[model samples]
Target: SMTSHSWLCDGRLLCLHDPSNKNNWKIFRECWKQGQPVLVSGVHKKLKSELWKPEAFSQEFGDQDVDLVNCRNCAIISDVKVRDFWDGFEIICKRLRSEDGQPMVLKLKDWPPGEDFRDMMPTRFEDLMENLPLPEYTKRDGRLNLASRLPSYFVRPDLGPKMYNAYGLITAEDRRVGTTNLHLDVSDAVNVMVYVGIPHDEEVLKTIDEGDADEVTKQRIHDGKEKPGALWHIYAAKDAEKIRELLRKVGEEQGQENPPDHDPIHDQSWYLDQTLRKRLYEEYGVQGWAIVQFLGDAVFIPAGAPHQVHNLYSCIKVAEDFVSPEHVKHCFRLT
Candidate 1:
C-alpha cells in the first residue's frame, strides 16, 4: 500500500488559467476520483478590487450593526466548539480591536437581501455565475462531460442565486497568526481573495506551506525578517473514508460509544485535532501542500477535501460555497 504522502507526491499540482482546455476536466475528475486537492488561480481579477479592500469595508460599514454580519465562531470567539453563527461584527471587532497587538481573524458573511453594500460592488453576482467556467471533460467515447451543477441549499434557507452565503475574511498581522486548525467543510467552496493590504514574504509563505506557524514566526524574528501576509494550507486526503475512520478514532478516544459519521459542528463538518494530525503525518505518512494566496487570486476547493488556512498578516478575503455533481456524494455523506 502506498503511503498518503507518496500518493500525493505522485500527482502534479496544477495551476492553470485557460478554462477551455480539455485537460481541465481531466484534472478536475482526477481530483474528485482520487480525493485530492487542486488550485485554480487568477479568476479573482475579474471582480472589482474595491469591494474586497479592508479600508473600503471600514469606511462603509464600520459602525453598522453586527446583527447584519455572520461570524465564523471558532473556539477563540465562542464558548462551545461552534463553526459559525449570525453574531454581528461588533463582537469580532472588540476581539480584534487592538490593531497592533494580538493577531486576529474576522469572517464577514450572510449579506441580507437589498442591502446597499451588497449592491455597491462593481461586479454583478450574475457575472461570476456566467463567467466562471467549470472544467470540461471528454469521455473515452468522445462524449463531453462537465461538472455543471450548483450546491443544493436545502439546509440554509437564506441562500439563493443572488443571495448566496458569500463571506469576507480579514486577518490582522499584529503578529503572524493562523486562523483555523486542520478541518474540512460540509460542502465545496470557492475562494476569491483580493489581497487589499500588505503582502507576505517568501519566508512566511514557506512556513505556512509547512503547516507550522509558531516556529516559522520565531525563526523569522530570529532572522530579522518581518513582512506580514496570509497563507492557505490545503491537504489532499487518500479518500473520504480514511478521514471518517480517523474521526471515528477521535470519537472513540473521547469516550463516545458510537462515533458520529461527521463533525458535530454544523458548518465545519470534519476536523483533526493536533495529536491526530501529527500522528497521521508522522506515523501514517499523510502529506499536504501549501499555496501563497496573493492579491487577486481565486481558488476552488473540492468537497470533503481536508484543508486548513492561516494568515501571516492582516488581510482581507472574499469567498463562497457551492455544490456540484462531481462531489455531491461526498457532500451528502458529510451532511
Candidate 2:
C-alpha cells in the first residue's frame, strides 16, 4: 500500500511535495526499516529568496581570494551572545599566523536570535533560514518532536555551550575542493538540508552515471582496471550491521588501520567496493541510489543509514541532525 510518492517498492528514492503531516511519519518508518532517504520539495522554495543570494556570501566574507583548500574545513559558530566572539577568534588566529587560510565553515545550533547578521564579522545564514518549520508530528513518547534536534559537538570534555544547530556554506570559490566526502553521522539521526545556492547550469544538476563518473573514481577505473562507479548521487546501505561487518572484514584484509577511516561502518571519503555495493543491493535490499537536486529542495537522511553525498557544484546548504523516536531503537543498536 505505497503511493507513487513513496519509495517502498519502486527501487527509487521517495520524493514528495508539501507532504501532509501523516506522510512524514510514514517515510520515517520506512527509512527506519530499510535505511532509505527522502527528498521533500517545496519547503525550500520558501527559503530561496531569504538565503539564495549568490553574491551575498563573498560580499560578506570578503572579496579577497585565498589559496584553495583541498579538504573540507569546518567551524563552530554557535548561537551565543558575544559582542566580539568571531572578531576575537579571528584576531587570535592571525596572531597565531593562521590568517588567510581556508574558508570558514559555519556550524550553528538552535535558531539564532537575529535572522541575518548577529554582530559577527562574517554573516550568518540562520536568520534567513526560518521559513521551513519542523514537521508537525509528535510521537506518544515525545520523541517525534525531538527528532529534529541539532547535534552537539562533544569532541572535548567541558568544551562549552553546545548549540542544537549545525550549518555549512559552500560557494563557487570552493569548486576546487569539490563536494563533501561520503559519510554517515555517528548517531541514527534526521537531517534536513536546504540548498541555498545552486548553479544556473543545468548540467550541474545532472546525475552522474558510469559514463559521467567523478574525476577521482574515473581515474580509479583506469588506474586499477576497476569497474566504473557512480557519482553526484547519494548511496545508502539497508543494513548497518551487515555493512559494518563487511567493511571490517575488508579493512583487515587490506591491512587498513585497526578502525579504518574509509570503511562503511564509519564516515567515508568514498563509496564501498562494487562487490559490496552489489551484495547490499541484491541480498540485503539497499535502496539502489538517490540524487537530490538543487531546485529549491530539502533532503532527509535517516538514522543508521549508510549514506553518502556527492554535490555537482560548489553549493550552499544548511543541515541539522537529530535522533528519531521511530528510529531510536536503531540508534541504540548501532551505538
Candidate 3:
C-alpha cells in the first residue's frame, strides 16, 4: 500500500505552500533544484483586487482589440472587441461544439492586444507591478532572482514580466479542443492564478430557472461555481529531447514528411492526453507531472523545461520570468 500524504490527497499531488514560511520555502526550493514543475496554493490572499477580475477588465477595456487564438492549431484569428468577446463567450463555444468547419475553443490571451502595459496604463501597472502579491523569491527584487541585477549594457526585453490570462469553455465535450501547444521557456518563470471560472451546463441553468433544486443538483451547481483552473504537463529539461523524438515520430506516422523540421512542440499540433501520456511513460519511459491549478495557486516552472497548458476553465494569472543563480548556466547556453 502507498503511504498517504497531503500532496496525494484526492488522487492528485497538489502541494500547499507559503513562501514566507521558511519550512515551505525549503520544499519549493527542492522542487526547483530538481527541475520539476511545482504548484503552490494560498496565493489569493496576496493577490486580491477587483482590477484583476474579468468583469472589471471588460468594463475598463471593453473597446480594446483582442487577439483570439484557436486552441486547436494555436492560430491567431484577427481581432474583436473585448466586450463582444466576453459577452458572447458562451455563444462562441456552443456555435462550434463537436463540429469541424468552425473551431471549437477560442481563447482571449493578450490582456490588451497592442498597447504596452506600463505606458498605456501607468496607474494600474505601476501600482500592481511594484507591489505584486507573489513569493519573495519570485519577485523582481528577490535576492535569488537576477532580474534586479541585469546590466545596463544589455537592453532587456519588454516581456521581462508578463500577464498571461487565457480563457476557454472547458465544459465542451471534445477535450482536445483547447490547449497551449507544447513549448519550452529558456528561463525560469513563476505564474499565479488570481481568478478562475467555469461554464454552467444547461441542466444547472434550467434548475436555477425552476427556482427549486435538489441537493444533488445543488451540489453539481456548487462545484461549477469554483474553478478547476488549468491542467499543466511539464517535462524535465533532460527529457526534452526524448519528448521531442516521440512527438516527431508520431508526426511522421501521421504523414509529416520532415518530422524534425516540423517542430511538433512549437507547431501547436499535438497535446499529450491520457493515451499519449501513457505511451510516453510505457514506451519512452519519460515521466512528467499533470498539475491541477486552482484559484490562488502559483506554479513555478524550472528553466529550460518544456511544458504546455490545458486550461480546465477560464483563468487570469500573472507570470514572471527570472534568472536563477543555479539555473543561470542554462540561460547562458541559450545564445
Considering every candidate listed, which one attains the maximal TM-score?
A: 3
Which digits, one per residue and each the tens of the lDDT, describe model 1 over residues 1-335? 11111112223444445533334565566665665555554454565555445444555545444322212344233231112222222244434432356423444333333434235443544444433435222111122221233244422111222222212344222123335445666555655454534423554445553444344233433473433334555666444455556666766887877736555323343434345556666755665554444444445666666665555444445455555456556544244
Q: Give the Å error, residue 104, model 3.
A: 4.8
- Pick out the ten consecutive residues of candidate 2 with the lowest summed lDDT: 155-164
TM-score of 3: 0.77
List where candidate 2 sits over 4 angstroms from the true fold: 1-12, 19-35, 48-50, 63-129, 137-143, 147-178, 186-207, 211-238, 249-264, 273-288, 330-335
Candidate 1 segments whose C-alpha is farther than 4 A from its true place: 1-11, 19-23, 67-105, 109-127, 133-178, 199-206, 212-230, 235-276, 332-335
Cα lDDT tens digits, model 2, 1-335, are: 13435331134556555633445656556654565666655554455454433344334543332222223343333333322222222222321111466434332222222322234322233432343323432211234534435333221111111112211223433332324444655444323343332212323223333212334333333474332111223445346666666667666777777654445545454344345566556665653454444434456666555565444433344444445554454434223
Best by lDDT: 3
Arranged by lDDT, best first: 3, 1, 2
Who is ahead in lDDT, 1 or 3?
Answer: 3
Which residue runs does candidate 3 get wrong by more than 4 Å? 1-14, 73-75, 89-104, 113-115, 120-136, 148-160, 169-173, 200-226, 259-262
lDDT digits (tens) for residues 1-335 of candidate 3: 02211352222333645533445555566656767666666666654466577777777788988777666666675676767556544345433332456634667766643346666556656544554333456666778777567664422224435666665544434354435767877667877777776654553233222222233323333673444566667788899878888998887777878734566765656777666777888889997765656677677788778887776566776677777765666656335
TM-score per candidate, in order?
0.58, 0.54, 0.77
Give the alpha-carbon lDDT of every model.
0.44, 0.40, 0.61
